[PDB]
Amino acid sequence: VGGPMDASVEEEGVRRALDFAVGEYNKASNDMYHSRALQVVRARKQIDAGVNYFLDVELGRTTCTKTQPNLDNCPFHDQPHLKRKAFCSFQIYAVPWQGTMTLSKSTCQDA
Amino acid sequence: VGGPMDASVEEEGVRRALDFAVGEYNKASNDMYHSRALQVVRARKQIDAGVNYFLDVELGRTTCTKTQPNLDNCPFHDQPHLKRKAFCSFQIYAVPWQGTMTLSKSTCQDA
């Protein structure tokens, strides 16, 4: 009911996946020795569609603290050394059946 | 040709996305002040399907260094304090048209 279906380690995409993983494990790992798979205890897979949102947005620093109300519409800093406008690029990954979002990518260039 | 289609900031899922993002921006940010969107310069979206692989795997530390050949089939450490078997869970996100993989999740419990 909804979850990942089993797949044979024999399967092409699974070998690719498993090779990739062990690969990253070794690259990241700090061992001078190479590790490799003894045995795959379980391999499953899930086709999963989601929407990516790409938003390019200018943010302004408002005059309200995070610990106060109305934040939605309160006014931007006009004092000279207090103001900051940043320009940001956000990538958001949305799985709509699940109602969840993740910030995949985030840069603010700030100016 | 292949890339993200424009979407109206008026659109429901986009407001959700933009609110989510600014939200995370503030949570992560170190400012005592709240930032909010001045203007959204550009908003696009892409429906994108990929396969998730979930692999549960026991890894063994082999006797070969990373800087030598045959690593695919070379033998595990048998000396007592040199051997390590770990048991790992890897989540791999594959976009097959693009031929790319990402390690989304990775834990080795080590024993």
Swiss-Prot record, chains A, B:
UniProt site positions, description: Reactive site:
G2
- What protein name applies here? Cystatin-C
Give the note. Potential cerebrospinal fluid marker for the diagnosis of Creutzfeldt-Jakob disease.
GO molecular function terms noted in the UniProt entry: amyloid-beta binding; cysteine-type endopeptidase inhibitor activity; endopeptidase inhibitor activity; identical protein binding; peptidase inhibitor activity; protease binding
Where it mainly occurs, coarsely classed, is: secreted
Q: In which tissues is it expressed?
A: Expressed in submandibular and sublingual saliva but not in parotid saliva (at protein level). Expressed in various body fluids, such as the cerebrospinal fluid and plasma. Expressed in highest levels in the epididymis, vas deferens, brain, thymus, and ovary and the lowest in the submandibular gland.
GO CC annotation terms, alphabetical: cytoplasm; endoplasmic reticulum; endoplasmic reticulum lumen; extracellular exosome; extracellular region; extracellular space; ficolin-1-rich granule lumen; Golgi apparatus
The entry's localization annotation reads: Secreted
What does the similarity note say? Belongs to the cystatin family.
The job of this chain, per UniProt, is described as:
As an inhibitor of cysteine proteinases, this protein is thought to serve an important physiological role as a local regulator of this enzyme activity.
| Record keywords | Age-related macular degeneration, Amyloid, Amyloidosis, Disease variant, Disulfide bond, Glycoprotein, Phosphoprotein, Protease inhibitor, Secreted, Signal, Thiol protease inhibitor
Short motif (Secondary area of contact): ranges: 46-50
Which part of the entire sequence is included in the shown chain?
36 to 146 of 146
